[PDB]
Design a protein around this ligand. Structure first.
Ligand SMILES: [Mg+2]
Ligand SMILES: [Mg+2]
Ligand SMILES: [Mg+2]
Ligand SMILES: [Mg+2]
Ligand SMILES: [Mg+2]
Ligand SMILES: [Mg+2]
Ligand SMILES: [Mg+2]
Ligand SMILES: [Mg+2]
Ligand SMILES: [Mg+2]
Ligand SMILES: [Mg+2]
Ligand SMILES: [Mg+2]
Ligand SMILES: [Mg+2]
Ligand SMILES: [Mg+2]
Ligand SMILES: [Mg+2]
Ligand SMILES: [Mg+2]
Ligand SMILES: [Mg+2]
Ligand SMILES: [Mg+2]
Ligand SMILES: [Zn+2]
Lengths: 122, 114, 216, 54, 120
RNA sequence: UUGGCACCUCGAUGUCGGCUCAUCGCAUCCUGGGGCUGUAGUCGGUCCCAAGGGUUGGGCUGUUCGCCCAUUAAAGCGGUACGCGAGCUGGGUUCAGAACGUCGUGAGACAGUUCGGUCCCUAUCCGUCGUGGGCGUAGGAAAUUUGAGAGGAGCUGUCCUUAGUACGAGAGGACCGGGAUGGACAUACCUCUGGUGUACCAGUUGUCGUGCCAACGGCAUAGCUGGGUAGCUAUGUGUGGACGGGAUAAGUGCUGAAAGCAUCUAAGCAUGAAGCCCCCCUCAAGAUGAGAUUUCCCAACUUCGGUUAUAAGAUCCCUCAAAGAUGAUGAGGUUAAUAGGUUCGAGGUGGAAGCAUGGUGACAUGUGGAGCUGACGAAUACUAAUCGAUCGAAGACUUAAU
């Protein structure tokens, strides 16, 4: 349940530290996003000397949310935050590290460098 | 009861293997996942926030902190995917829904054992 | 191409082949009895009356639908069966494979047999245009005085009327609904029950018409 | 919110059909036979309901 | 349940007053809805008087009023005393239905339906 | 659109824009079907048929227009008192206050700008959405019903495979055909996650009270806080728009002359669009053209004509919801489990009161998953649904076949 004007923390080392969403990608009239989905974004806060700086427009993946996801077995997974990881073509990051935990749905989403770098999948 | 027919239909889906636990206590959950290759079994060691529901619709959610990030993994109690449930402590708790832990992290999230 | 009547009891869970959770709906179909076998010769269309929920017999001073009335008791005697509470027809079903007084069972259907359930929806009362038609609420601040009302109605002098299909407040209640392409999970015969995957219409204690799907 | 036309006697009377009140839920009291009463209610006179004074 | 032209707390107090007045008087003239709601209250109280424990006195004091009735021995007594000492001893074989209602007829002022409610 | 004329309105036709609600046209924005190509292929240009569905969120501005950010299959053009102010707002223009520039001797003025500035109405008729009573449908009733008709839905991407194929120097890269999975939308529902949950559970403050301790109660937004049953719900759970048929549109063809040939047409035949009539879903016999089937009920007096209460049946009246503004619909009405209570439970809260024990004490422990528990499941006539009352047929004539 991630929309326009949501600020998401950033779970990589690309330089971005807080990020604001613009449009959710996937189709027309798409109101919200959720884990595994891609978003356009902008950087409202960046770490000094970061690769990705303030006011740069950029895509990203939603990695973890509070409005978590349901699985077919009835198991749910939620979090205590909302987080992004910043990407380009080829569904992989322009950073090199990932912070905190990550969900499994990115496997189905073919975000495999992310899953491999994530210290804990859940 | 719930209903003389509901119960008699959904009896077979139950599980009597499992222990008696309460919200407060640190337990493990040997989940039987199916990763895209094969079946592995990863464990989710955390404290139980809550249990609700009656019958096959019974649930329990567990909370672990991985790397400062709070995780909240909900389950149906009667899954076939839960191969095993181990129990470590029996925490002392004056409530049944420990939602006050979601705002607390560190020394304040400590549950006292009996 | 078959048919069976029941009662919505409620909803439960059940676990599939791979630990897959399944939201399911319980439909009790006991005392199902064919009563009249309509024919193209006499009625002009081939069909099958079906009974449900055996009820009590004639009483001289009866005062409810509990105690069956004398027309109905005769209608069922013609089938050599008990009087019935709910009757409905089934045109899609074949004629030859049913005779009169024959008792239908849940065991006709099978796991995986796909269906469409038809039932009378739950009763919401007099409701407004939002609740009833999904309209939008006007703004709740900024000096508004239009929050939940239906907005405009027509245009003006040209079209100095209100078209018939306009949407206004009214009774949101019990409209007949058919849900399609639902799957039958499991069947219980001691209890004479059918487990149906999904969210079938109407309330508890409520009639349900289960029948095989016309589209496949 | 203001009528343009008066309401004729004809329309007035066509509308004042269903405004009437009905005969109440009246019955006899068998303690006194006459002195009709309301059904499922006590008799004011006999103080009775199923034989017993009240 | 039912709401009686009163908000929640006014309803609670009206119900306690009706219960207590019934316990005192053994019959009262009221409206049918208030009767139909206070019968539940009363009957649960009689059940507590039959269970007869201290905790039951303590739970019935949460619902009764502190009133003083003069007895026919010219004696001072409370509602709760009367209840647990007299009323629960009357009904020791009766399993519920500690109260009846008699629809009387329509009141003049408000067209309300008056009833009589007593604990036979 | 800019305007013209000044025909309706000056004993009032409310005036830009946005909002809510939609509706229509097609000169079609996407999707559909086709022809020509300076169409290799992907993509395109241009025109023809086509109005079924869909046709975005924000920044700036009172703004429409417009520029921009980011998407989308596409981000359509227009009308409807530049649609809609007895449906909203009132930013803007357009009253009175004030100030700047400029004009004016001046009062004051400016399609110049600026700050501020009261948007009345209980709907009679039509109309529309829902809901009932009367009568009628040639006896009176109960149930099931076909369907003259009406309404709805009608969207579309990304991926995989065919196949890295056809094509092409390569870069690149199809149609057709099969499958999968999503966006928006509609619908039903609440087992799941969440919301509410004012007669649920517990904690707690202040003050007053039940004579005091203990325990309880009232007032403080439900005093506040933490959870929450039923129901109501979405943000959640399921489903849907599937597969097809018939006749057509632009077109594409066969045969084939008029006109020895040619020639899709004149006779004739075949094919052909998301479009039309169907298939799908709902309402429907007041369809006065009033349908059909199944079953039930079937006397006595008559002026002879007709009556009469009565049958079946349904109501009054009462207990109640799965229903509900009221009527109505439905469960039931003592040959009774309809509601209340009572006994059991589920779910919820989370360890009562009292007693004892360890402590100076605040407290903690045991008795004891304790006690409480509104709506949900079951059993139980303890209370109330008493006795009763009313309405409701005896089936016209004619013609024909029997
Ligand atoms: Mg307001
Ligand atoms: Mg209060
Ligand atoms: Mg005038
Ligand atoms: Mg006027
Ligand atoms: Mg055209
Ligand atoms: Mg206008
Ligand atoms: Mg106005
Ligand atoms: Mg306006
Ligand atoms: Mg004006
Ligand atoms: Mg001057
Ligand atoms: Mg001017
Ligand atoms: Mg001001
Ligand atoms: Mg729910
Ligand atoms: Mg529930
Ligand atoms: Mg206090
Ligand atoms: Mg005290
Ligand atoms: Mg005071
Ligand atoms: Zn009498």
């Amino acid at each position: 349940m991630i929309q326009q004007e949501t600020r998401l923390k950033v779970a990589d080392n690309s330089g971005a530290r807080e990020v604001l969403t613009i449009k959710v990608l996937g189709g027309s009239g798409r109101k919200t996003a959720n884990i595994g989905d891609v978003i356009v974004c902008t950087v409202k806060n960046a770490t000094p000397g970061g690769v990705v700086k303030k006011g740069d427009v950029v895509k990203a993946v939603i990695v973890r949310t509070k409005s978590g996801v349901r699985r077919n077995d009835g198991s749910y997974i939620k979090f205590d935050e909302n987080a992004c990881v910043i990407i380009r073509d080829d569904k992989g990051p322009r950073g090199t590290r990932i912070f905190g935990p990550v969900a499994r749905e990115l496997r189905e989403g073919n975000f495999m460098k992310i899953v491999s770098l994530a210290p804990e999948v859940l | 009861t719930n209903h003389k027919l509901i119960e008699a239909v959904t009896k077979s889906q139950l599980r009597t293997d499992l222990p008696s636990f309460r919200p407060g206590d640190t337990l493990r959950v040997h989940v039987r996942i199916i990763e895209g290759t094969r079946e592995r079994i990863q464990v989710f060691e955390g404290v139980v926030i809550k249990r609700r529901g009656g019958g096959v619709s019974e649930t329990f959610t567990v909370r672990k902190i991985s790397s400062g990030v709070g995780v909240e993994r909900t389950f149906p109690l009667h899954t076939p995917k839960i191969e095993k449930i181990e129990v470590k402590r029996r925490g002392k708790v004056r409530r049944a829904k420990l939602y006050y832990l979601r705002s607390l992290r560190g020394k304040a999230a400590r549950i006292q054992e009996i | 191409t078959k048919g069976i009547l029941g009662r919505k009891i409620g909803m439960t869970q059940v676990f599939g082949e791979n630990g897959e959770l399944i939201p399911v709906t319980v439909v009790e179909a006991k005392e199902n009895v064919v009563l009249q076998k309509k024919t193209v010769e006499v009625d002009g269309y081939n069909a099958i009356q079906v009974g449900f929920e055996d009820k009590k017999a004639y009483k001289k001073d009866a005062k409810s639908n509990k105690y069956a009335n004398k027309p109905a008791e005769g209608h069922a005697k013609k089938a050599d069966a008990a009087p019935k509470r709910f009757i409905r027809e089934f045109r899609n079903v074949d004629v030859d494979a049913y005779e009169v007084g024959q008792e239908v069972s849940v065991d006709t259907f099978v796991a995986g047999d796909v269906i469409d359930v038809t039932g009378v929806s739950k009763g919401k009362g007099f409701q407004g245009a939002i609740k009833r038609h999904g309209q939008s609420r006007g703004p709740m601040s900024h000096g508004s005085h239009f929050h939940r009302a239906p907005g405009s109605v027509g245009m003006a002098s040209d079209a100095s009327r209100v078209f018939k299909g306009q949407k206004m407040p009214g009774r949101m209640g019990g409209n007949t609904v058919t849900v399609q392409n639902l799957e039958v999970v499991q069947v219980d015969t001691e209890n004479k029950v059918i487990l149906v995957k999904g969210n079938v219409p109407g309330p508890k204690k409520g009639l349900v018409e289960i029948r095989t799907s016309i589209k496949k | 919110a203001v009528p343009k036309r008066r309401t004729s006697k004809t329309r007035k009377n066509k509308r004042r059909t269903h405004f009437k009140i009905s005969v109440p839920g009246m019955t006899e009291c068998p303690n006194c036979g006459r002195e009709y009463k309301l059904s499922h209610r006590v008799c004011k006179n006999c103080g009775s309901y199923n034989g017993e004074e009240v | 349940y039912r709401k009686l032209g009163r908000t929640s707390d006014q309803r609670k107090a009206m119900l306690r007053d009706l219960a207590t007045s019934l316990i005192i008087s053994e019959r009262i003239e009221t409206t049918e809805a208030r009767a139909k709601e206070v019968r539940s209250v009363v009957e649960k109280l009689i059940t507590l008087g039959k269970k007869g424990d201290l905790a039951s006195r303590r739970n019935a004091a949460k619902t009764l009023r502190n009133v003083e009735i003069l007895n026919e021995d010219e004696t001072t007594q409370t509602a709760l005393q009367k209840l647990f000492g007299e009323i629960a001893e009357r009904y020791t074989e009766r399993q519920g239905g500690y109260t009846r209602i008699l629809k009387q007829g329509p009141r003049r002022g408000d067209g309300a339906e008056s009833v009589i409610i007593e604990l036979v």
